[PDB]
Scaffold this motif. Structure first.
Motif, PDB file in Angstrom:
ATOM      1  N   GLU A 160      69.650  -4.353  39.070  1.00 34.69           N
ATOM      2  CA  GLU A 160      70.279  -4.921  37.498  1.00 34.69           C
ATOM      3  C   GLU A 160      70.702  -4.073  35.947  1.00 34.69           C
ATOM      4  O   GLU A 160      71.354  -3.533  35.252  1.00 34.69           O
ATOM      5  CB  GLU A 160      70.047  -6.390  37.517  1.00 34.69           C
ATOM      6  CG  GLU A 160      70.505  -6.889  38.521  1.00 34.69           C
ATOM      7  CD  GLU A 160      70.585  -8.680  37.875  1.00 34.69           C
ATOM      8  OE1 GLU A 160      70.863  -8.836  37.189  1.00 34.69           O
ATOM      9  OE2 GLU A 160      70.750  -9.553  38.966  1.00 34.69           O
ATOM     10  N   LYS A 161      69.126  -3.333  35.661  1.00 43.82           N
ATOM     11  CA  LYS A 161      69.191  -2.989  34.525  1.00 43.82           C
ATOM     12  C   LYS A 161      70.518  -1.304  34.243  1.00 43.82           C
ATOM     13  O   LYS A 161      70.454  -0.888  33.638  1.00 43.82           O
ATOM     14  CB  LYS A 161      67.421  -2.392  34.601  1.00 43.82           C
ATOM     15  N   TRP A 162      70.152  -1.594  35.763  1.00 46.01           N
ATOM     16  CA  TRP A 162      71.194  -0.367  36.035  1.00 46.01           C
ATOM     17  C   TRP A 162      72.709  -0.727  35.928  1.00 46.01           C
ATOM     18  O   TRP A 162      73.436   0.157  35.656  1.00 46.01           O
ATOM     19  CB  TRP A 162      70.883   1.094  37.768  1.00 46.01           C
ATOM     20  CG  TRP A 162      69.274   1.950  37.410  1.00 46.01           C
ATOM     21  CD1 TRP A 162      68.850   1.924  35.930  1.00 46.01           C
ATOM     22  CD2 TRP A 162      69.153   2.512  38.413  1.00 46.01           C
ATOM     23  NE1 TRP A 162      67.195   2.549  37.411  1.00 46.01           N
ATOM     24  CE2 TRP A 162      68.104   3.107  38.236  1.00 46.01           C
ATOM     25  CE3 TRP A 162      69.689   3.415  39.316  1.00 46.01           C
ATOM     26  CZ2 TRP A 162      67.473   3.730  38.382  1.00 46.01           C
ATOM     27  CZ3 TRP A 162      69.252   3.991  40.050  1.00 46.01           C
ATOM     28  CH2 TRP A 162      67.539   4.320  39.983  1.00 46.01           C
ATOM     29  N   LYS A 164      73.815  -2.881  34.429  1.00 50.76           N
ATOM     30  CA  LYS A 164      73.904  -3.552  33.294  1.00 50.76           C
ATOM     31  C   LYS A 164      74.761  -2.130  32.353  1.00 50.76           C
ATOM     32  O   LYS A 164      75.687  -1.563  32.090  1.00 50.76           O
ATOM     33  CB  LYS A 164      72.758  -3.905  33.009  1.00 50.76           C
ATOM     34  CG  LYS A 164      72.643  -4.693  31.062  1.00 50.76           C
ATOM     35  CD  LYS A 164      71.694  -5.523  31.259  1.00 50.76           C
ATOM     36  CE  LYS A 164      70.917  -5.675  32.547  1.00 50.76           C
ATOM     37  NZ  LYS A 164      70.327  -6.723  32.256  1.00 50.76           N
ATOM     38  N   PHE A 165      73.615  -0.815  32.886  1.00 55.15           N
ATOM     39  CA  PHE A 165      74.459   0.591  31.907  1.00 55.15           C
ATOM     40  C   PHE A 165      75.802   0.828  32.219  1.00 55.15           C
ATOM     41  O   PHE A 165      76.543   0.957  31.723  1.00 55.15           O
ATOM     42  CB  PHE A 165      73.429   1.202  31.684  1.00 55.15           C
ATOM     43  CG  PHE A 165      73.603   3.246  32.076  1.00 55.15           C
ATOM     44  CD1 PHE A 165      74.475   3.273  32.254  1.00 55.15           C
ATOM     45  CD2 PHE A 165      73.519   2.795  30.237  1.00 55.15           C
ATOM     46  CE1 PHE A 165      75.005   5.026  31.859  1.00 55.15           C
ATOM     47  CE2 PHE A 165      73.796   4.679  29.918  1.00 55.15           C
ATOM     48  CZ  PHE A 165      74.101   5.557  31.040  1.00 55.15           C
ATOM     49  N   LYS A 327      72.026  -8.524  28.038  1.00 54.42           N
ATOM     50  CA  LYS A 327      71.323  -7.973  26.522  1.00 54.42           C
ATOM     51  C   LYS A 327      70.015  -7.028  27.347  1.00 54.42           C
ATOM     52  O   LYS A 327      69.838  -7.543  28.792  1.00 54.42           O
ATOM     53  CB  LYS A 327      71.137  -9.007  26.498  1.00 54.42           C
ATOM     54  CG  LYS A 327      71.339 -10.124  25.571  1.00 54.42           C
ATOM     55  CD  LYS A 327      70.942  -9.053  24.394  1.00 54.42           C
ATOM     56  CE  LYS A 327      70.586  -9.663  22.849  1.00 54.42           C
ATOM     57  NZ  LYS A 327      70.964  -8.881  22.366  1.00 54.42           N
ATOM     58  N   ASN A 328      69.749  -5.624  27.142  1.00 49.99           N
ATOM     59  CA  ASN A 328      69.218  -5.004  27.606  1.00 49.99           C
ATOM     60  C   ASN A 328      68.393  -3.979  26.775  1.00 49.99           C
ATOM     61  O   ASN A 328      68.001  -4.891  25.411  1.00 49.99           O
ATOM     62  CB  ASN A 328      69.794  -4.131  28.586  1.00 49.99           C
ATOM     63  CG  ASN A 328      70.676  -2.981  27.480  1.00 49.99           C
ATOM     64  OD1 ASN A 328      69.750  -2.168  27.096  1.00 49.99           O
ATOM     65  ND2 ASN A 328      71.449  -3.824  26.282  1.00 49.99           N
ATOM     66  N   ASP A 329      67.269  -3.446  26.375  1.00 52.44           N
ATOM     67  CA  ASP A 329      66.237  -2.982  25.895  1.00 52.44           C
ATOM     68  C   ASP A 329      66.238  -1.717  25.545  1.00 52.44           C
ATOM     69  O   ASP A 329      65.676  -0.867  24.787  1.00 52.44           O
ATOM     70  CB  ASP A 329      64.611  -3.194  26.558  1.00 52.44           C
ATOM     71  CG  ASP A 329      64.469  -4.746  26.075  1.00 52.44           C
ATOM     72  OD1 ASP A 329      64.552  -5.404  24.995  1.00 52.44           O
ATOM     73  OD2 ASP A 329      64.016  -5.217  27.582  1.00 52.44           O
ATOM     74  N   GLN A 330      67.646  -0.672  25.825  1.00 51.93           N
ATOM     75  CA  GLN A 330      67.333   0.450  26.410  1.00 51.93           C
ATOM     76  C   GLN A 330      68.438   1.022  25.899  1.00 51.93           C
ATOM     77  O   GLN A 330      68.474   2.220  24.989  1.00 51.93           O
ATOM     78  CB  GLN A 330      67.952   1.275  27.566  1.00 51.93           C
ATOM     79  CG  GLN A 330      66.375   0.949  28.819  1.00 51.93           C
ATOM     80  CD  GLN A 330      66.399  -0.714  29.350  1.00 51.93           C
ATOM     81  OE1 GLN A 330      67.268  -0.919  30.720  1.00 51.93           O
ATOM     82  NE2 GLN A 330      64.833  -1.940  29.281  1.00 51.93           N
TER      83      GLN A 330
END
Ligand code: YEW
Length: 384
Positions: A160-162, A164-165, A327-330
Motif C-alpha cells: 500500500e505504501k507504493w 499510495k504514491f 497519510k504517509n511518511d515519505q
C-alpha cells in the motif's frame, strides 16, 4: 497581423503546415490516371522536382535507427529510436494513415499532438517532433525507460505504501490534464509510464476531449478501455452523454483496486460481461475475502467506484487529497515528484528496454482513378 501566424507553431498556416499542403497535393495527384488532366500535369511538372528535394531536407523516418518496438495500439506501434545525426534516443509513435481512414477516425491525433507538444508539464510525456510520410504519422517523444505500470504490477506484489504514491501521482497528473481543460477518458496502467527516476507521466491522449465552459462534454460514443470505462461514459453510447472530469476519477479507483488486489474489479470472460458488470457495479464490486486490504484503501476504492453523483472528486481534487489513505511518511502533495520513487529503474544503457516486453511482427491505399484526397486530413500535423 498575419505574419504572426506564419511564425506561430500552433497556427494552421505556419510554414510547416504550408509545406504539408504542398506535399500532400503532390502525393494525391501524382498518378498516371490523374496525369491525363493537363492542369494536374502542368502542376506536377512545375513542382514535382522541388517537392522531392524538400522531402529530403525535412525530417523523415530514415533519420532514425529503429532499436526495438516497445508498444502497440489499434493504428500503429511505438518504437525505441536513436536519431542518427544527433545520437539522441526517443520513443517514436506511428499511426497508419490507411488504417485511420479505412476505420473512419482520422481526428484523434490532433489533441494528442497538442498536449504532448504544449502541456509543458512534468506529468505529461513531451513531444519534440511530429512529421509524416505518405503512409504514417510520426510522433517523436521523450523515451520513458522505467516501463509502464502494467509491467511494474506484473513484476511486484504492490504494498500500500507504493500504491499510495502511484495513486497520488496519477491524481496529480490527471489534475494537470483537467487544468488544461481536458478530460482524459482512457486512464489505465498501460498509459502510465515511468521516467528514469521512477516517476509517472501520462502518454496516450487519443481519447482526450476539451470541456465546455461548464466543464462538461457532449458525447454519444463510449470510449476508452473496457475494464476501466466508467458507467456514465458507457451509458453515453447513443444517448446524449453530458458528463465531466470525474469520469477520470473512476478509472483511478479501478487502477488502485488492480494494484492492491491483482485483478481488475469488473473482470469478466466476455466484453459484454464486463459492460454488464460495470452497469451493475453496486452489486458486482466485491473484494476477495483473502485480500488483506486496509480499511482506508477499501474506503477510497469504493469512494471512486460509485456513480458520478456521489463520486469522490466530483467537487475537486482537494477532497481526494485529504483522504486518510494518503497519510504517509515519505511525501507530501507538494513535493511528491521530488521524493524518491518506490522503484528506481536500474538502467544499463541509454537504449535499455528491459522494462518493456518484446512484441512480434501492412495494407496501403488503392491507386486512385479520380482525386480522392487521402492526404488532406493530415495537413498541419508536422511540427518542429
Ligand atoms: C488510437 N491509438 C493508437 O492507435 C495507438 C498506437 C500506438 C500506441 C498506442 C498506445 N500507446 C502504447 C504505448 C506507448 C508508449 C509510449 C512511450 C513513451 C516513452 N516510452 N514509451 C514506451 C508512448 C505512447 C504509447 C502509446 O500511445 C495507441
Amino acid at each position: 497581423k498575419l505574419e504572426a501566424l506564419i511564425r506561430d507553431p500552433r497556427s494552421p498556416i505556419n510554414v510547416e503546415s504550408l509545406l504539408d499542403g504542398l506535399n500532400s497535393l503532390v502525393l494525391d495527384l501524382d498518378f498516371p490516371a490523374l496525369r491525363k488532366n493537363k492542369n494536374i500535369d502542368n502542376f506536377l511538372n512545375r513542382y514535382e522536382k522541388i517537392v522531392k528535394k524538400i522531402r529530403g531536407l525535412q525530417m523523415k523516418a530514415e533519420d532514425y535507427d529503429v532499436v526495438k518496438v516497445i508498444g502497440r495500439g489499434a493504428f500503429g506501434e511505438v518504437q525505441l529510436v536513436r536519431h542518427k545525426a544527433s545520437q539522441k534516443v526517443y520513443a517514436m509513435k506511428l499511426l497508419s494513415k490507411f488504417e485511420m481512414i479505412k476505420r473512419s477516425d482520422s481526428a484523434f491525433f490532433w489533441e494528442e499532438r497538442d498536449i504532448m507538444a504544449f502541456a509543458n508539464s512534468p506529468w505529461v510525456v513531451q513531444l519534440f517532433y511530429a512529421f509524416q510520410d505518405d503512409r504514417y504519422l510520426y510522433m517523436v517523444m521523450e523515451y520513458m525507460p522505467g516501463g509502464d505500470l502494467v509491467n511494474l504490477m506484473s513484476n511486484y506484489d504492490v504494498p500500500e505504501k507504493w500504491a499510495k504514491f502511484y495513486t497520488a501521482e496519477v491524481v496529480l497528473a490527471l489534475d494537470a490534464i483537467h487544468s488544461m481543460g481536458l478530460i482524459h477518458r482512457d486512464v489505465k496502467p498501460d498509459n502510465m509510464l515511468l521516467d528514469k527516476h521512477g516517476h509517472l507521466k501520462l502518454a496516450d491522449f487519443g481519447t482526450c476531449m476539451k470541456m465546455d465552459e461548464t466543464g462538461m462534454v457532449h458525447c454519444d460514443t463510449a470510449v476508452g478501455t473496457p475494464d476501466y470505462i466508467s458507467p456514465e461514459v458507457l451509458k453515453s453510447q447513443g444517448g446524449d452523454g453530458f458528463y465531466g472530469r470525474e469520469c477520470d476519477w473512476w478509472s483511478v479507483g479501478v487502477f488502485l483496486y488492480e494494484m492492491l488486489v491483482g485483478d481488475t474489479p469488473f473482470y469478466a470472460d466476455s466484453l459484454v460481461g464486463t459492460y454488464s458488470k460495470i452497469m451493475d457495479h453496486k452489486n458486482s464490486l466485491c473484494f476477495p475475502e483473502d485480500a488483506e486490504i486496509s480499511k482506508h484503501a477499501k474506503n477510497l476504492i469504493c469512494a471512486f467506484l460509485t456513480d458520478r453523483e456521489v463520486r469522490l472528486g466530483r467537487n475537486g481534487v482537494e477532497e481526494i487529497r485529504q483522504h486518510p489513505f494518503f497519510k504517509n511518511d515519505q511525501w507530501h502533495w507538494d513535493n511528491i515528484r521530488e521524493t524518491a520513487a518506490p522503484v528506481v529503474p536500474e538502467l544499463s544503457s541509454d537504449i535499455d528496454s528491459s522494462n518493456f516486453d518484446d512484441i512480434e511482427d501492412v495494407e496501403t491505399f488503392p491507386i486512385p482513378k479520380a482525386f480522392v484526397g487521402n492526404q488532406l486530413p493530415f495537413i498541419g500535423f508536422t511540427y518542429y
